[PDB]
């Protein structure tokens, strides 16, 4: 496998989004993963509707909109629904709304998703290298996470109890420190312009490799 990967260099990553006070991290993680696939399949980079998932991938999928959800069930919703609208056609309002999906605004589809084996960082590396960006859950409950500004994030108090949905868009090493390149959804002002480099191959740090999954078109 290549020593480093950055899907932003292949134009497969849309710009960082800001979820606001709505717990839609899972929805942003899911669309971000599909956005890369759509780019690989059609050649067009398009932001997909996180709001679409918030309002429609609900109870039936075990999700609670602005109060949390799963990236995997979000993927299944897209498969079952036979589509997902573009962000432009179904804009993010940071609040729970009635489902307003309309196939005339469909911007992507999904045929299946894959959940990687628990905590295998090498397997995650392979997926990121050969498949594309991967949705993952990380433990982001620690004060240090919120205050992260640069370098490689390592928190002694992190655990494998994930609670925040994000997107791994690459990996590499910075000054002798291996890391996973993570796209967050707290706006471009968080970390390094919306991104955070988290410790890689450090005992599944913050549970980043605990529950990885990626969709396919």
Ligand X SMILES: *[C@@H](N)C1(NC(=O)[C@H](CS(=O)(=O)Cc2ccccc2)N[C@@H](c2ccc(O)cc2)C(F)(F)F)CC1
Residue 20 near ligand X by CB under 6 A:
no
Catalytic residue among 12, 184, 204, 206: 184
Span of 22-30, 40-48, 88-96, 144-152 interacting with ligand X by CB under 6 A: 22-30
Measured from the CB atom, is 66 or 84 closer to ligand X? 66
**Least distance to ligand X from the beta carbon of 172, Å?**
23
* Secondary structure string (H, E, C) spanning the chain: CCCCEEHHHHCCCCCCCECCCCECHHHHHHHHHHHHHHHHHHCCCCCECHHHHHHHCCHHHCCCCCECCCHHHHHHHHHHHCCEEECCCCCCCCCCCCCCCCHHHEEECCCEEEECCCCCHHHHHHHHHHCCCEEEEECCCCHHHHCCCCCEECCCCCCCCCCEEEEEEEEEEECCEEEEEEECCECCCCCECCEEEEECCCCCHHHCCCCCEEEEC
Residue 145 near ligand X by CB under 6 A:
no
Is 188 annotated as catalytic?
A: no
Q: For ligand X, what does the binding mask look like between residues 178 and 217, x meaning CB under 6 A?
A: ---------------------------------x------
Is 67 annotated as catalytic?
A: no
Catalytic residue among 12, 22, 25, 56: 25
Residue 133 near ligand X by CB under 6 A:
no
- In the complex, the residues that contact ligand X under the rule CB under 6 A are 23-26, 62-64, 67-70, 137, 162-165, 211
């Amino acid at each position: 496998l290549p020593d480093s990967v950055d899907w932003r260099e292949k134009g497969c990553v849309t710009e960082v989004k800001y979820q606001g006070s709505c717990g839609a991290c899972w929805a942003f993680s899911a669309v971000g993963a599909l956005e890369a696939q759509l780019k690989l399949k059609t050649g067009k980079l398009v932001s997909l509707s996180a709001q679409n998932l918030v309002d429609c991938s609900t109870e039936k999928y075990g999700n609670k909109g602005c109060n949390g959800g799963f990236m995997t069930t979000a993927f299944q919703y897209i498969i079952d629904n036979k589509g997902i609208d573009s962000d432009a056609s179904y804009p993010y309002k940071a609040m729970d709304q009635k489902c307003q999906y309309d196939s005339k605004y469909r911007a992507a589809t999904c045929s299946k998703y894959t959940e990687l084996p628990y905590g295998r960082e090498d397997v995650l590396k392979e997926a990121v290298a050969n498949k594309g960006p991967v949705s993952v859950g990380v433990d982001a409950r620690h004060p240090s996470f919120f205050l992260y500004r640069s370098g490689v994030y390592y928190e002694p108090s992190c655990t494998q109890n994930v609670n925040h949905g994000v997107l791994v868009v690459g990996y590499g090493d910075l000054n002798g420190k291996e890391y996973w390149l993570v796209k967050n959804s707290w706006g471009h002002n968080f970390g390094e312009e919306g991104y955070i480099r988290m410790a890689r191959n450090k005992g599944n740090h913050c549970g980043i490799a605990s529950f990885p999954s990626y969709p396919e078109i």
